[PDB]
Every structure is written in C-alpha cells, then in structure tokens.
Amino acid sequence: DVPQVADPEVAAMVRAEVEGRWPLGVSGLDEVVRYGLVPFGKMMGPWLLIRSALAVGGDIATALPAAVALECVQVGAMMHDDIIKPAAHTVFGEPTAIVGGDGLFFHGFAALSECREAGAPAERVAQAFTVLSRAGLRIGSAALREIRMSREICVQDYLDMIADKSGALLWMACGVGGTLGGADEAALKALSQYSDQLGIAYQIRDDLMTLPVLLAHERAPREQQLRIERLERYKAMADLVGAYDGAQAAREVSHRHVQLATRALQTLPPSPHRDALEDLTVP
Amino acid sequence: MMGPWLLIRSALAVGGDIATALPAAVALECVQVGAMMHDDIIDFGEPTAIVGGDGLFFHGFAALSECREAGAPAERVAQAFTVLSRAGLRIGSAALREIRMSREICSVQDYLDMIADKSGALLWMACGVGGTLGGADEAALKALSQYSDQLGIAYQIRDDLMTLPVLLAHERAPREQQLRIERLLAERYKAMADLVGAYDGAQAAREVSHRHVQLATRALQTLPPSPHRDALEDLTVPGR
Numbered sequence: 001d002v003p004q005v006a007d008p009e010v011a012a013m014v015r016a017e018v019e020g021r022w023p024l025g026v027s028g029l030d031e032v033v034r035y036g037l038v039p040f041g042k043m044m045g046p047w048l049l050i051r052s053a054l055a056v057g058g059d060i061a062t063a064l065p066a067a068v069a070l071e072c073v074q075v076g077a078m079m080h081d082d083i084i085k086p087a088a089h090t091v092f093g094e095p096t097a098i099v100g101g102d103g104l105f106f107h108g109f110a111a112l113s114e115c116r117e118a119g120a121p122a123e124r125v126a127q128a129f130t131v132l133s134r135a136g137l138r139i140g141s142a143a144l145r146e147i148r149m150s151r152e153i154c155v156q157d158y159l160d161m162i163a164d165k166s167g168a169l170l171w172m173a174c175g176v177g178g179t180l181g182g183a184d185e186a187a188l189k190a191l192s193q194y195s196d197q198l199g200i201a202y203q204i205r206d207d208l209m210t211l212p213v214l215l216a217h218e219r220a221p222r223e224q225q226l227r228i229e230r231l232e233r234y235k236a237m238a239d240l241v242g243a244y245d246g247a248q249a250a251r252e253v254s255h256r257h258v259q260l261a262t263r264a265l266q267t268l269p270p271s272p273h274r275d276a277l278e279d280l281t282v283p
Numbered sequence: 284m285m286g287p288w289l290l291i292r293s294a295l296a297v298g299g300d301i302a303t304a305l306p307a308a309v310a311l312e313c314v315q316v317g318a319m320m321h322d323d324i325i326d327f328g329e330p331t332a333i334v335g336g337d338g339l340f341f342h343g344f345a346a347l348s349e350c351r352e353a354g355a356p357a358e359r360v361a362q363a364f365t366v367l368s369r370a371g372l373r374i375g376s377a378a379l380r381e382i383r384m385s386r387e388i389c390s391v392q393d394y395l396d397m398i399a400d401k402s403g404a405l406l407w408m409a410c411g412v413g414g415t416l417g418g419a420d421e422a423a424l425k426a427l428s429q430y431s432d433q434l435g436i437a438y439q440i441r442d443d444l445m446t447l448p449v450l451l452a453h454e455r456a457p458r459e460q461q462l463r464i465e466r467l468l469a470e471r472y473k474a475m476a477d478l479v480g481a482y483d484g485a486q487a488a489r490e491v492s493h494r495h496v497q498l499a500t501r502a503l504q505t506l507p508p509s510p511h512r513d514a515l516e517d518l519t520v521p522g523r
Contacts, residue, residue: 028376028379028380029372029375029376029379032379077337080333080334080337083329083333084329084330084333084334094324094325095324095325095382096379096382098321098324098325098333099321099325099375099378099379099382100379101337102321102340102371102375103372103375103376105337105340105371106340106368106371106372106375107372109340109344109364109367109368109371110365110368110369110372112364113361113364113365113368116361116362116365121357122357122358122360122361122362123351123357125357125361125364126348126351126357126360126361126364127348129344129345129347129348129364130345130348130349132341132344133341133342133344133345133348134341134345136337136338136341137338137341137342137345140334140335140337140338140341141338143334144330144331144334144335147330
C-alpha cells in the first residue's frame with residue numbers, strides 16, 4: 001500500500017510565509033495587521049485550504065498565497081467582531097481597529113490576487129474571488145442573525161446559522177483551495193458538503209461546552225417549555241438540559257453530521273490529503 | 284460619488300465596452316458605500332454598519348468577478364482585482380496616518396501625500412478598475428493614476444478651503460505666529476480663520492489646487508481624442 005504523492009509539512013510553511021510577510025518590527029498599517037495575526041496559532045483555516053487544493057491535484061505555489069488571503073480575511077473578521085487576547089479596539093482604540101480589520105480584509109484580497117502570478121489562470125482566480133466573496137457574505141449574515149436570534153428560541157434555524165457560521169468558514173477554505181486546485185464540479189460539491197457537515201459538528205461541540213437548549217426545550221413538557229421560552233440564569237438552563245438529556249442528544253446529532261462529512265470526502269481521490277481531511281473530523 | 288461616473292468614462296475612453304462598465308459600477312459603488320459606512324463609525328446601529336459594510340466589500344469583489352458573465356476577459360478582471368485591492372490598502376495606510384496626525388502641524392508634502400494616498404486612491408478605485416476592464420495599456424493607466432491623485436488632492440483642498448491653508452499659513456508665519464497656530468489644535472475657529480487670512484493661506488491653497496488640476500488635465504492628454512476624455516476634463520471644472 002504505497003501513496004503516489006508527497007504529504008508536505010503544510011502548517012510550518014504557512015506560518016513561515018505569514019511571518020515572512022509581516023515580520024517582527026513592522027510599523028504603520030502592517031503593525032495593526034500583525035497585532036491581529038500574532039500569536040499565530042495552528043491556522044487550521046489556511047492548512048485546510050492547502051490540503052483541499054492538494055487533494056484535487058493542485059500546486060502549493062498556487063495554494064500558498066490563497067491560504068494567506070484566508071488567514072487575513074478571518075483575522076480581520078475577528079478584529080471587527082470584537083468591537084461589536086487583549087482586544088485590538090481595547091489596545092489601539094476603536095477607530096484604529098476598524099481600519100486595521102479593513103487592512104486585513106484588503107490584504108486578503110491582495111494576496112488572493114497573487115494567485116495569477118503564482119500560476120493560476122485568470123479564470124480560476126476570478127472563480128476563487130467569487131467563492132471567497134460568497135462565503136464571506138455567509139459568515140457575515142450568520143454573525144448578524146446570531147445577534148437578532150439571541151435570547152429567543154429557534155431546530156433548523158439554529159442549524160442554518162451554524163452552517164453559515166462554521167461551515168461557510170470551512171468552505172471559504174475548501175472552495176477556494178479546490179478551485180485553485182482545478183477541482184471539477186462534483187469535487188467542489190463534495191467539499192462544500194464536507195465543509196457544511198463538519199462545520200455543524202464543530203459548532204455543536206462548542207454548544208456542548210445552543211443546540212442542547214433547543215433539544216431540551218423540544219423534549220420538555222409544556223409546563224417547562226413555557227419556562228424555557230421565558231428563560232444564575234445559566235444554571236437554570238443547565239438544569240433543564242440535564243433533565244431532558246439535551247447534551248447527549250446534541251452529541252448524537254453531531255455524530256451523525258461527522259459521518260456525512262466523512263461520507264462526502266469519498267468523492268475525492270484517495271490520497272494522503274483526503275486522509276488528513278478525514279482525520280480533521282476526529283475530536 | 285464621481286466614482287461611478289469616473290469608472291464608466293474611464294473604461295470607455297480606452298475603447299472598453301459599456302456592457303462591462305455598468306455592472307462594474309454596481310461593484311465599485313458597493314466598495315465606496317462600505318468605506319463610507321466605516322467612516323461613519325470612526326466619526327443603522329454600530330454592529331450593522333460594521334458587519335454590513337464588511338459585506339459590501341465582498342459584494343464589490345464578487346460583482347467585479349461577474350464582469351466575465353457580462354463579457355469581460357478573465358485576464359483583465361484578475362488584474363483589476365490587484366488594482367482594487369491595492370487602492371483599498373492605500374486608503375488604509377492613509378486613514379491611520381490621519382488618525383496619528385490630529386492635534387499637530389506637519390509638513391505640506393506630508394499632507395499632500397496623505398490626501399493623495401487616501402482621497403487620490405479613492406478616485407483611482409474608479410479610474411483603475413474602469414480602464415483595466417476597458418483594456419488600457421500601462422502608459423494609459425499611469426495617466427489615469429496621475430489624473431486620479433491630482434484631482435483627489437484638488438477637490439480635497441476645495442473641501443479644506445470651505446488643512447492646506449492652515450499648513451501654508453504656518454509656512455509663511457513667523458514663529459511668534461507659528462506657535463499660536465500650533466496651540467490651536469491641542470471660538471478657536473475664529474482665531475484660526477483670522478490667522479489663515481493674515482498670511483494668505485487660503486489664497487495660496489487655491490493656487491495649489493490649480494496646479495494639481497493642471498496636472499490632472501495634463502495626464503488626460505495621453506488618451507485618444509473622445510468625448511469620454513473630454514468628459515474627464517469636465518470633472519476638473521469645480522462646478523462639476
């Protein structure tokens with residue numbers, strides 16, 4: 001049983017590339033950009049893009065600046081999210097954090113533009129910007145609806161949001177990576193279902209630390225349902241979830257979507273990259 | 284917003300197609316409405332103005348990408364991605380510089396480059412995307428690049444005139460009067476207005492606007508003759 005391709009060190013090259021672009025000691029706008037970037041963390045977003053690009057037969061030289069783009073767009077969305085680690089608006093003032101987050105967004109767009117010079121045909125580069133933008137609108141929508149849905153009961157409406165919260169974030173990676181790798185339409189649809197399903201499983205894992213409340217609210221007698229609809233307040237919530245096995249039921253919903261994620265992957269060619277994408281579903 | 288008018292004429296002056304510039308303008312004004320929504324915060328609801336404005340940047344790039352579905356050659360669209368994104372970064376580096384300049388006097392050439400990179404790139408957003416999607420060569424693009432920045436400075440001073448006059452009055456003032464101007468940043472308006480006038484700052488500012496307007500009209504000459512190129516000279520007319 002011999003793999004036919006290499007399995008590169010995908011995390012270390014992305015870190016070195018991001019730090020190389022915004023090294024210690026930058027000033028001006030690069031200073032605010034870097035504050036958002038550092039400490040780097042694992043960068044599972046960028047690593048995901050490179051694996052998805054390589055899973056379909058792509059080049060690292062194309063995938064690497066797209067991964068940086070994905071890094072910048074995500075950190076800028078986080079820098080703006082804090083306004084609405086010490087927070088950048090805390091550190092520099094709220095106005096500077098706005099320009100900074102925009103600088104991170106536009107560094108994303110500029111780095112994704114390098115894909116042409118890196119070797120990608122202009123038609124794929126435009127299709128990559130289309131994927132990036134549409135997933136960007138999904139991540140923004142769910143963030144807003146998260147605010148308008150809070151303090152009120154939603155089961156499907158919660159699931160849509162977390163797909164646009166977590167799955168669109170994964171699809172920004174997988175769709176741009178797959179697009180830059182030259183994926184055909186069946187592989188891109190496979191990567192999108194993988195992103196949506198794994199994003200759902202990821203968010204429920206966060207809920208488990210919310211879906212349990214809705215699973216608990218769903219199962220409760222009407223006397224308690226009217227109590228949950230109305231609802232120290234955390235501990236009363238944890239009481240009703242425990243009473244109606246809300247946390248266990250949430251685990252069973254999440255475990256079903258993990259399997260639809262590993263199912264979706266089997267469309268991809270067998271490779272060390274597909275196996276890593278499967279590996280990312282395990283806790 | 285001369286930007287949508289600037290993008291459409293800019294694409295057509297080099298022989299571009301209208302079927303492309305019209306959706307590109309939805310894309311272009313999308314970005315400026317986003318930039319302006321963030322300018323309201325730095326000076327609806329705060330969440331929606333931030334999150335919705337971020338959304339409009341993504342709207343602009345997607346719409347620019349749809350110019351191919353409208354007929355644009357993919358190669359021109361990709362090069363415009365670079366132009367649009369770098370113009371945004373220019374505004375980013377300048378907007379921070381403006382924040383770091385308040386309450387203090389600086390050199391004039393600092394001010395002109397500050398407003399050339401902020402406001403001049405705001406016009407280049409229109410002109411560059413238009414000409415590149417219109418199919419312009421590199422010498423024609425630099426001419427739009429000089430034309431955008433020279434007019435951006437000019438109209439920014441015109442807004443200052445309603446700041447360059449304060450800097451130019453400071454240049455001509457003796458230190459006994461230079462200091463007085465410095466204290467008025469860190470009722471004040473009447474003290475400043477009296478000073479700008481006594482050293483002809485406002486009149487000197489108008490002549491600076493005319494110089495850049497000329498450079499704006501100079502740079503247009505490199506493009507072929509057309510009403511589209513004539514339209515672009517009309518934007519230097521301050522009644523326009």
